[PDB]
A paper describes a structure:
Notably, the third structure (CIII2 b-c) was asymmetric, with the FeS-ED of one monomer being in c and the other one in b positions. Such asymmetric structures of native CIII2 have not been observed frequently, although they are proposed to occur during QH2 oxidation. The third model with one FeS-ED in c and the other in b positions yielded the expected clustering pattern depending on the local FeS-ED conformation. To our knowledge, no native heterodimeric CIII2 structure of bacterial origin with different conformations of its FeS-EDs has been reported. Thus native CIII2 is not always a symmetric homodimer, and the FeS-ED of each monomer is free to move independently from the other.
The FeS protein external domain (FeS-ED) is mobile between the b (close to heme bL) and c (close to heme c1) positions. In R. capsulatus, both the diffusible cyt c2 and the membrane-anchored cyt cy carry electrons from CIII2 to CIV in respiration. Here we report the cryo-electron microscopic (cryo-EM) structure of this functional bc1-cbb3-type SC (CIII2CIV, at 5.2 Å resolution), together with three structural conformers of native CIII2 (at 3.3–4.2 Å resolution).
Numbering used by the authors:
A (entry chain R), B (entry chain E): 11 to 191
C (entry chain P), D (entry chain C): 2 to 232, 237 to 428
E (entry chain D), F (entry chain Q): 5 to 107, 126 to 257
The structure:
Amino acid sequence: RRDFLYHATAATGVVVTGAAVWPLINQMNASADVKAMASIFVDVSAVEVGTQLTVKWRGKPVFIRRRDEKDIELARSVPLGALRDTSAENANKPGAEATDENRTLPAFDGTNTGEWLVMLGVCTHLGCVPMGDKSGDFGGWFCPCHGSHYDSAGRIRKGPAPRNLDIPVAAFVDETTIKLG
Amino acid sequence: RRDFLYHATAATGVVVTGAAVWPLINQMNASADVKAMASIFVDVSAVEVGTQLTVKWRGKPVFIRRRDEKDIELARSVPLGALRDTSAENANKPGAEATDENRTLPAFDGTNTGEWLVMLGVCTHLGCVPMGDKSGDFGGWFCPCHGSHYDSAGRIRKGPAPRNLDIPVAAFVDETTIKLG
Amino acid sequence: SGIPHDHYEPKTGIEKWLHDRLPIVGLVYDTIMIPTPKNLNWWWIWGIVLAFTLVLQIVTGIVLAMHYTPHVDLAFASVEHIMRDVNGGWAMRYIHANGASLFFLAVYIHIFRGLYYGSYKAPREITWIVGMVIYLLMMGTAFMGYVLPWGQMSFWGATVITGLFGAIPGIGPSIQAWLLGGPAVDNATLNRFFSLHYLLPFVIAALVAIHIWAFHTTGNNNPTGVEVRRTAEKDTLPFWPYFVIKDLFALALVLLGFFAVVAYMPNYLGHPDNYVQANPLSTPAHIVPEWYFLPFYAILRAFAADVWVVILVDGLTFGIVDAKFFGVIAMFGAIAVMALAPWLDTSKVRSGAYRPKFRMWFWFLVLDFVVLTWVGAMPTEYPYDWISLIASTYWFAYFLVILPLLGATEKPEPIPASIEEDF
Amino acid sequence: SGIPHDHYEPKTGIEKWLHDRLPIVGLVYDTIMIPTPKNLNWWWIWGIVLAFTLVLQIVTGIVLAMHYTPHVDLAFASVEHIMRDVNGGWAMRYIHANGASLFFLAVYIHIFRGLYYGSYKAPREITWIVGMVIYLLMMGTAFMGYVLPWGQMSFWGATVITGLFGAIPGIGPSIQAWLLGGPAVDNATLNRFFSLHYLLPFVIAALVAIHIWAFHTTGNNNPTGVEVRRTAEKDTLPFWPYFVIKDLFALALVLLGFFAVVAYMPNYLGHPDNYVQANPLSTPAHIVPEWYFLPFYAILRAFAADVWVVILVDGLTFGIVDAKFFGVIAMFGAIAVMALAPWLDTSKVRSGAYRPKFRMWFWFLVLDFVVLTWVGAMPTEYPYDWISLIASTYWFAYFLVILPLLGATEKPEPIPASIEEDF
Amino acid sequence: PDHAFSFEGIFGKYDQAQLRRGFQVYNEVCSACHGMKFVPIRTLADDGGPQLDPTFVREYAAGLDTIIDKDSGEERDRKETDMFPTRVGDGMGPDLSVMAKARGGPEYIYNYVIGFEENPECAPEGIDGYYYNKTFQIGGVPDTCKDAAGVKITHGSWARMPPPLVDDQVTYEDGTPATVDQMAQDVSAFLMWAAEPKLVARKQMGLVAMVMLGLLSVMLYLTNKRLWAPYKGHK
Amino acid sequence: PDHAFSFEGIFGKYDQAQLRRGFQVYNEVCSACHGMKFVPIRTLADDGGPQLDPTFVREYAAGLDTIIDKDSGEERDRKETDMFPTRVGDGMGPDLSVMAKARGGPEYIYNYVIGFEENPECAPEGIDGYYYNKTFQIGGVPDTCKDAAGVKITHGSWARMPPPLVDDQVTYEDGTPATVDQMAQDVSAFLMWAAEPKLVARKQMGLVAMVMLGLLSVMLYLTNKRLWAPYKGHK
Ligand code: HEC
Ligand code: HEC
Ligand code: HEC
Ligand code: HEC
Ligand code: HEC
Ligand code: HEC
Ligand code: FES
Ligand code: FES
């Protein structure tokens, strides 16, 4: 029939066109050489605890910074109230409250948390690198792209950045190493 | 006047157009990163005449070797007969016979030829680098890629290599220098 | 009326055998002897400026691409190879880089000329639509291009102006990764941008093709709310040679100033930090993307829930429309509303030379544009936040409410007849 | 006669407000409902094939350029990155590489269809000129492109097909150096070729624009020596939907065969030596540039002063016209004479379906083309030299002398009237 | 007869046990001189070929040579993301990444590895440092074996590679007679993988496309026959 | 006053003696830590700047560090065609190729090299391993010198570079008082050369183009005034 045959030819043409177009839009997706996206062993190795440590990975920096008591007490003295993001972005654990006890890090294979904190050095606003070394209006990190003030533990404050600095999955290698991935 | 003014405006437009076009045709010419390549010099400067001298250029080595009497006499005692390539590949002169008098080199700006010989250290078979320092079955160069025996003056012998070792265009710089290009 | 004067191909045998391919018919009848009014001021030149600038950019780029190598390890080096070894080098690069500046400066005056003399008003909607489409294409182009030198500002500008697409929910990260070629910026992004950057200009030329086709079919706007009175039209001198020569004179002046800049003040409009190689591990202070995107950058980074007029706390009613998404929508709307204008101005009138209130509001709009330009560079600390909020609010207010109210109660002026204004 | 049927924009308000930009008027009146005769065989499809192939090549290339890195040290590696990592990879490359083959195959049939049915005869000269211009552009394009992989055949093909320009005296070496970016081949040549290779296709599209404009203004040839009898023309059905569907059917078949090749016989038309990296120090045996340049390669390397019909010993009268220059002139002339044809055939007649002697000579010409194709690959040793000389001589003889003699004494046939051939 | 492989045809998606055997052979024999830079190690887990266990891949990678770095010069642990090593000179050979395409290809490798017999009865002395092959055609030939105009009278020529394998060079874990011929076939298939890993996807795409386009073409033929009916009915 | 250079204006084609002095200092002082990879050694003969004698250039090149190769790993002779060396880490600094543009530029270098005075009377102890500079603004500051909201009360900050020169560090062959200020000016000019070598050509092109375009524009103005005369005469 007129209608059936004509419309079916059109439908088949459309289907073939789409099957030909899809790969032109698929090739731009992540290739296999980008699929890898594996881990990294960074050795703390006497980093002069208290200043900072940065390492490249996945194309972004991974901040490994020891803790300075004044920085710590400022951290542990932050009630969940008045905290923009209270989710503790760290993916090594569940959505537990953004508390310093959970938010600092694993305990060297021992039992302590208020001494090391390794987070992803990527501002959640649009992905800039905040400046460290005690900066901003909260004694933490300051993003120069738009002015986002981070706190000691990395939770976002005073700016457009919606959430704190995430924490990748990482465990220790028996007191001198870090495993990123 | 009508004619003068109109034609002069047209002429000025044309002149400006040409002054703007010329560089468009100039950028395609040799950039500065390439000029420093056409002209390369090699300061011989007491190379302990008789062993060898090699220098990189154009991505291939340029062999500058002094002459050892035994090597010389073996050279000058080679009749054109039984010589695979009798063309004297050297491009600093015409297709004159591959004779040692023409095949050795210019004469320091003086008058002598049986003392220096600079050829392109590239086997004519497929472009390997023959080993020097008196090697092979003819007291010259030996190609390890397929076994081509070169002679004292560089003429091919005993192998698949069809022709001898070419000689680039080179002149002297008054008794201590060589100009390659 | 609309005298095309096809020339009837009566010249000679050459002009008679050309009846195979009409081409000269087109040129003569339409694109050279196009009747244009006499009442044209010096604001109707910038289109010639834009066409010439586009040709210039295309040419210089085709030349640079003969020496630029798209790769993280060889881009900077190739740029220096250009500025040092190549014969002309610095000229091509400075002419390419700065000419973009002139291009955008010229489109700004081209656009604001339009808003004044009702060039968006009917029957000239298609031209406006095509022009906004172009503006978008050329913004994207310049963005893709600022990245190629792989300096320091390149990296971070790309980072943020791609995190935008990732702000939105559900389909943000996917688009981000599909655009960057990966999670973050690297050589893949560079290749995409180079290709794309080397392709869109031709689309722009075609769109310019339609841009020129439209306003030849539709008469050029004129300082007055009047048409060429087709019904024989003693007004409306032709384009060639009169307006051609006028535009070429202005263009010569503009190129004179442009080359003076190129030769004495070339690094003025640039960011020095783009002369240091990239470090994904260190961000400089005051990225300040560029100067032709500061308005929208400010409209973006203004809404942050930091004012009593903060509509973000109210938009939080829906848990999905956070701040970032709100700013992105605000920017896209800042442009979409400018595109929608011709269907918002409810006035059966024309050029604001006979609408005073419109004059005042329009000059306030120009001032707002300049202010936004100056604010995108300054931090988000008090008082600049209030300023940016006020300016964005006025932009939206103008384009949404102000024009209807005028179209209602804005006719205290005697309109001029007889486009032949022999004053 | 020549019914354009502009549609009068009577559809509705949408088709009436489109009086701002005519565009749909153009499409409908001209480029869709273009009266074409009924007498069309299956040889009038290859233009659609060429247009589609051009689009295909442009698209696939724009995709590849997102992963190809023009540099001697990173081209091969990027090509392998494509064929291995990228999602589609091999497809794009094989479709790009082979589609060039189909492109040239299709232009060959497009051209020889033309020589038979007097499509170069008046009043269709402009189409012929434009087509030869295109042919030149696309040859140069394919040449620039075969170089980009920086294999082994790339290098040496470039070397020789650039030494050509250097053969000529006085201005040979200068042009050679200005084209290679230096004395010999290196990255500079690669950048030039990539840019150029990424730019000419658009010029080709424009030229295709004029190509299509011409034969719409000038009626499509038709199997016979007759026109559409404009004065109403019961003959000359429209293009859409009839011929559109016919061409699309043939195109589907052609793409079917093409993809079967791509998927089973992709490396067949290629040279394996292009899969080994380049060595400027070692040349392989039987460079054999490609298969769409062998005719002219043979016409070039035929004249060598090695036959009693050797006109080089006679051209040596002038000490400047040596052999090399003679072969180069012979090739340029092999093309220039094909372009000059329409002013050499002195016949007030048309398609060789009514000119027998012309049929015989034309089939001999096709055979000569095939022979030249087969000879450019075989050495210059006896007997192939005599064969190449004979074939080139016949090519030139046909195009110079044969057509005049026919036009003189070639009308023993009853021409058909009434292009409505209801047989 | 010709000992056709599995992939030689419209089907034959790279029987994988053959490829694992070729891998046992390549890493223990050919790797001593040859390399495959154009080949990432992670491909030993991608489908189509040897779908080995990733952990074994990481182990085998760390057990290879040291590829230093691209940013900070320091001998790393050679992670799978890197490429196979490269043996370059001083008694070494070319790269086998795509040698299966730079020559019907794999049959060349099979009939090359196969064939290193003693020197014939024209030049039994042979050559010092060079060994004889019956199929390589790009090697030197002594003057004693050439004809009157330089052409060789031997089937093959003299190759610089020594005989790679003896009667029972290695053991197969699966259980199989590891004679020279089976090893040659297996390694040829492995190299063909290293060169064309996306073969099976090629064939499946070809099938799908042939089918869809045959369908489209048939439908268009029907449409054409229909439209052109009232004009081709009286004749 | 501001100690303007020669090139600071519409003229000033890089007084070359100043650049030779800056070179004497750069290779003997700054080269110990800094590098200029973006600078070929063959530019010390190109016009515009130091038009030194090529032979001295080849000597000075061969007398530098060893840049190995790109094809065959082997420590060569560091031919001029190569680029200046690179000092990368372990107590070293950035590259000075284009530092004269990544900051009015050279005045930054002058007023930076100029100024390393002792620690002020807010933190006289200072810092261990860091030294104080009047004009660097991107360095750390002790908490004793910061205000109530993190801003520094010092003019400059603490830079990791030590004082590069004393009262009379080197001799000038031409004959000139080699105090610190003259050396600073000279080296600033040398770096500006290394960054903008094609300055003088820039200025000459600008002059030529301004002239030609003024001429063209005047002629077009006359043509316009003429053509538009019969329409602007009665009013
Ligand atoms: C050194 C002891 C080698 C080992 C072990 C293997 N190969 Fe090799 N190979 C080697 C050299 C020096 C050469 C060059 C030979 C020449 O005359 O140029 C080769 C060459 C090959 C080739 C290419 C043959 C050609 O036609 O060019 C192939 C296909 C090849 N070799 C295969 C191969 C395989 C499969 C091996 C492991 C079983 C192997 N070779 C080992 C040096 C050495
Ligand atoms: C090591 C002993 C050095 C020598 C000798 C010189 N420089 Fe240097 N420089 C050095 C370091 C470690 C740094 C980094 C300082 C920091 O705090 O990051 C620098 C920096 C510079 C700069 C950049 C300043 C800036 O604003 O970033 C300049 C312009 C500079 N140095 C100039 C310079 C000159 C001209 C020298 C020779 C006279 C010189 N330096 C020597 C290390 C060392
Ligand atoms: C044929 C290629 C090509 C075309 C067409 C082209 N450019 Fe570019 N563009 C380049 C290259 C190459 C670079 C990098 C070299 C450079 O920065 O000068 C570049 C860089 C840029 C830069 C950064 C300049 C710098 O030095 O940082 C801008 C801005 C830019 N392009 C804008 C544009 C715009 C806007 C257009 C047209 C609408 C355009 N370009 C047309 C090739 C081109
Ligand atoms: C967003 C708006 C917009 C943009 C961007 C734009 N145009 Fe226009 N253009 C207009 C309008 C409106 C007119 C007035 C048409 C009329 O008067 O009929 C116009 C008119 C013109 C004219 C004729 C009269 C004049 O003003 O000179 C030219 C030529 C022209 N444009 C060229 C260009 C070119 C070239 C570009 C870009 C490369 C461009 N325009 C970009 C909207 C735009
Ligand atoms: C947008 C870019 C682009 C366009 C348009 C384009 N190509 Fe290419 N072409 C490439 C790239 C990239 C390569 C190198 C990668 C490759 O060889 O597949 C290439 C390579 C080639 C090759 C060698 C193929 C091979 O694998 O050795 C040929 C032949 C070729 N092009 C011909 C053409 C012709 C003919 C046209 C149109 C008339 C065309 N190309 C259009 C980008 C393009
Ligand atoms: C050197 C000659 C030549 C070349 C090359 C050429 N054409 Fe043509 N083309 C012709 C002639 C002659 C005609 C017949 C015109 C007529 O019958 O009025 C024609 C007709 C056509 C037609 C309409 C009738 C037909 O034969 O299909 C199309 C469509 C077409 N060409 C497209 C193309 C495209 C697309 C290209 C290249 C990408 C191309 N041609 C290359 C000479 C050429
Ligand atoms: S990007 Fe980090 S705050 Fe804007
Ligand atoms: S390559 Fe020199 S002899 Fe074979």
